Each structure stands twice: as structure tokens, then as C-alpha cells.
Curated annotation (Swiss-Prot), chain A:
<dbReference type="InterPro" id="IPR029044">
    <property type="entry name" value="Nucleotide-diphossugar_trans"/>
</dbReference>
<dbReference type="Pfam" id="PF02348">
    <property type="entry name" value="CTP_transf_3"/>
</dbReference>
<comment type="function">
    <text>Activates KDO (a required 8-carbon sugar) for incorporation into bacterial lipopolysaccharide in Gram-negative bacteria.</text>
</comment>
<keyword id="KW-0460">Magnesium</keyword>
<keyword id="KW-0548">Nucleotidyltransferase</keyword>
<dbReference type="GO" id="GO:0000287">
    <property type="term" value="F:magnesium ion binding"/>
</dbReference>
<dbReference type="InterPro" id="IPR004528">
    <property type="entry name" value="KdsB"/>
</dbReference>
<comment type="pathway">
    <text>Nucleotide-sugar biosynthesis; CMP-3-deoxy-D-manno-octulosonate biosynthesis; CMP-3-deoxy-D-manno-octulosonate from 3-deoxy-D-manno-octulosonate and CTP: step 1/1.</text>
</comment>
<protein>
    <recommendedName>
        <fullName>3-deoxy-manno-octulosonate cytidylyltransferase</fullName>
        <ecNumber>2.7.7.38</ecNumber>
    </recommendedName>
</protein>
Swiss-Prot record, chain B:
<dbReference type="InterPro" id="IPR029044">
    <property type="entry name" value="Nucleotide-diphossugar_trans"/>
</dbReference>
<dbReference type="GO" id="GO:0000287">
    <property type="term" value="F:magnesium ion binding"/>
</dbReference>
<keyword id="KW-0963">Cytoplasm</keyword>
<dbReference type="InterPro" id="IPR003329">
    <property type="entry name" value="Cytidylyl_trans"/>
</dbReference>
<dbReference type="Pfam" id="PF02348">
    <property type="entry name" value="CTP_transf_3"/>
</dbReference>
<comment type="similarity">
    <text>Belongs to the KdsB family.</text>
</comment>
<dbReference type="GO" id="GO:0019294">
    <property type="term" value="P:keto-3-deoxy-D-manno-octulosonic acid biosynthetic process"/>
</dbReference>
<dbReference type="GO" id="GO:0008690">
    <property type="term" value="F:3-deoxy-manno-octulosonate cytidylyltransferase activity"/>
</dbReference>
<keyword id="KW-0460">Magnesium</keyword>
Length: 238, 244
């Protein structure tokens, strides 16, 4: 398998996000450390910023210069001319501590199943987080395919509440695996009315009647780096 | 083409002897039987474990199938009727609830035709939600569909979540919420087997039996009700209202 890291540069709160220093190396290079450890055969950082490109290349990383998240992966997939059956894992460029094991988990999951997309989830063990619409919840069928993803608290467990949340709740992790040919197709699809309601791009897949596999992360990752607080945390932990 | 089975629930708190509650010279169950005849069903069976219900249905010329006194879900009670009436597996069955004396005949036929066309486990119906109160009412089951009208998920939670709208307040709602209506269509062969599948854990979490279908990888088709039907009689108020 192959790892593509779409470094998003613009951001309120964290200006030069991929290039922010974490103990002597830039954040994007740290995500490069992890991807390599996953055993990936290609690790491509996708960006349209020269300064980022020179930082990855100085660390020995491959870069693909791009001209909407998934659409950036489509461009890299075309520019690299990967075959349709190539397994691709999308790792966000704000995750310098993502464990390599979970990168490999999603790849093996996609490899062993006949399905367009695989992804990962972790259990929710607290109510604040269960009713937080920033925590995307997911409900599964017996084989681990996603029935639905939502910012609503699903499944609605009227028994856990009301006691002052049990063990039925999963939080969706923003790491994805797909075959290259699926990515090619996916981005040509008209968007769905659902995705703009929920603000979850992944519902396009379920809307079109396609399947997404979800495994429980074999290792719970730390939160990404979106804020100065997240940056101070990650700085002290690495 | 199709058969209607009405599992009349007898014991209710706050109705009580529900199917037999008089509505202008006829008991509720007989009214539901009238609606079912109008749909062109080739058979309309009321399933019951009570003799008083049996006789009231039979006096109006309605077919009855006695079912076990051991407690049964509505579905489990249909599956007994299927066993007892010896319908072939490909027979199309519509489950119509017994507290719906005003149910339009056209929507009964809509569900049968919907099942007959597709090659799906279940067909069912939905209606749009207008009030934020109802959107946020856990007694109102929501459903979100895929592009071909198949349920992605049913839930008492407010799905789909309108994040930009609900970041500002829970006060208001767009025009996209769907409320699930408890009428169902399926094949005799399917129901026979489905009542023996072990429950999904989802079932007891959401208190929604139909999630069993989705849990085991089968599909439920959902059309928007062709004629918005009136509320089921579940309270003395519903009963006073329906008598007019």
C-alpha cells in the first residue's frame, strides 16, 4: 500500500500549520516519520506551497504539487498514475503522533474486503463527548459496515441516559483507506444533499449505495494538532 | 397480489380492550378491516388471542386467525398467521396496525406494490416532519434515506443532524426530516425466517425492531406516504378526535 498526506496550509489559529516546529522538525515531517513506520511503499505529501515542499524534500520525502481534501488525493492519484487496485491510505497532516499500526490496520482492512472504503473508530466513554457534535458517531452492522455516520448522538440510548454512557458508542476517526480506482470514481459523483446537511463528506458514499467498513482502532490515537493548546500538548509529549 | 394481516393489540393501559373501542357503532378493529378491504387485498386476517375480538371481527364478515396467548411481538404474531394459513413463501404480506381506523387504502397498496417491484427484505413508509418539537421528540422515529429511498438508519435521535442550524439553536428545523410510519410489507418466506434471527443489540438500545433488518445486511425500502395519514388511536384524546 501507499500513503498520501494532504497538508492543508491555511488555518485560523495555526497559520503555517504543516511547518509549525515540533522539537526541531516541522509537523509534516513528523507525520512522514509515522507513515514510513507503517511500512508504506510510497509516502506522498500533497501541497501547493513551495516552503512545505522544500521541508518534506529536505527530510527525504516525496512531494506532489497540487492545483477540497479528497479531490487533492484524486490529483495525486492521477499525477502518479497508480493502477486502479492500488491501496491508498489518507493520513491527515495534523497528526504527528498517529501510531503506524492503525495506518497499517486500515490498509489490511481494505485489502482483505471487496469494498470501496475502509475506516476506523474508537469507543466513546463520556457524555460530554457523546453529545458533542464535533465528535462524529457511527453505527455498524454485524459485519462492521457503517449503517450511518452522524453528529447526532447515535444510537440513541434512552437507558444509559437517564442515570447521569455505557459501551455502545463509537467515535469515527478521520483516517481512510480506498483503492485508487474508487477515488477516481468518487470525486466525479455529484455531491449528495445529506453531506451538506450533516457536513460529513463520507455520507456521499452511503447515499450512492456503496459500503464503508469500520474496524475498532487497535490503538487509540491522540487528538490532532488544530490549536495552540494542541501544539503545546504535543510538544511536551514528543 | 397481496394479503393484509392486522395484529390487534388487546391489553393497553389508557385504552384497554383497544381493538373493541366503539367508533360510531363499530369497533376500531372493524374500521381497520374496512380500510384493508378497500386496498384490493385478496385476504384480510385479524390476528388475536381474544374471543371477544374474534367474534366482533367475524360478525362483520372478517377472517380471524387465533394466535398464542404466550406474549408475541406484532411480527411474531404475523409469522404464526403465515404458518397457520399456509401461505407460500412468495406471498406479499402487509402488516397494518390495529389502531388505524382512518388509514387510506391507497397507502396500503403503495407498500405492497413497493415490495413487489424491488427484491428487498422489507418495504415501509415515511412522512415529513414540520415542527422542531417533533424533530426532537424521541417518540417520533426518524429515518434517513439513500438516493434510491432505502433506509440508512432509523433512530429516536434527531437525524440527520443539521450542524450549522443546531450550532445556533435547537429552536428551528428545515424541511428534510422524515418520520417513520409503522406499516410494513414483506414476503411470507422472509417473515418466517426473520422472527427466528437473534436480535440485534441495536434493537434494545433504540427500541426499534426493524433495525434487525439493517443489522443483518438486508435492505428496507422507504417511500414518502402518498397520502399523509392520521394519527393512530393511542389515547382517549386520539379516540375523541377520531370519532368526528
Amino acid at each position: 500500500f501507499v500513503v498520501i498526506i494532504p497538508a492543508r496550509y491555511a488555518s485560523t489559529r495555526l497559520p503555517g500549520k504543516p511547518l509549525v516546529d515540533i522539537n526541531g522538525k516541522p509537523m509534516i515531517v513528523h507525520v512522514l516519520e509515522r507513515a514510513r513506520e507503517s511500512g508504506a511503499e510510497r509516502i506522498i505529501v500533497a501541497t501547493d506551497h513551495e516552503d512545505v515542499a522544500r521541508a518534506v524534500e529536505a527530510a527525504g520525502g516525496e512531494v506532489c504539487m497540487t492545483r477540497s481534501g479528497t479531490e487533492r488525493l484524486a490529483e495525486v492519484v492521477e499525477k502518479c498514475a497508480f493502477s486502479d487496485d492500488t491501496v491508498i491510505v489518507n493520513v491527515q497532516g495534523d497528526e504527528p503522533m498517529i501510531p503506524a499500526t492503525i495506518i497499517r490496520q486500515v490498509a489490511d482492512n481494505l485489502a482483505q474486503r471487496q469494498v470501496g472504503m475502509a475506516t476506523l473508530a474508537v469507543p466513546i466513554h463520556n457524555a460530554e463527548e457523546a453529545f458533542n457534535p464535533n465528535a462524529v458517531k457511527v453505527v455498524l452492522d454485524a459485519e462492521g459496515y457503517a449503517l450511518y455516520f452522524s453528529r447526532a448522538t447515535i444510537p440513541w440510548d434512552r437507558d444509559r441516559f437517564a442515570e447521569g454512557v455505557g459501551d455502545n458508542f463509537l467515535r469515527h476517526l478521520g483516517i481512510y483507506g480506498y483503492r485508487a480506482g474508487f477515488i477516481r470514481r468518487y470525486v466525479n459523483w455529484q455531491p449528495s444533499p445529506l453531506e451538506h446537511i450533516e457536513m460529513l463528506e463520507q455520507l456521499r458514499v452511503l447515499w450512492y449505495g456503496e459500503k464503508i467498513h469500520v474496524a475498532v482502532a487497535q490503538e487509540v490515537p491522540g487528538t490532532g494538532v488544530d490549536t495552540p493548546e494542541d501544539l503545546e500538548r504535543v510538544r511536551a509529549e514528543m
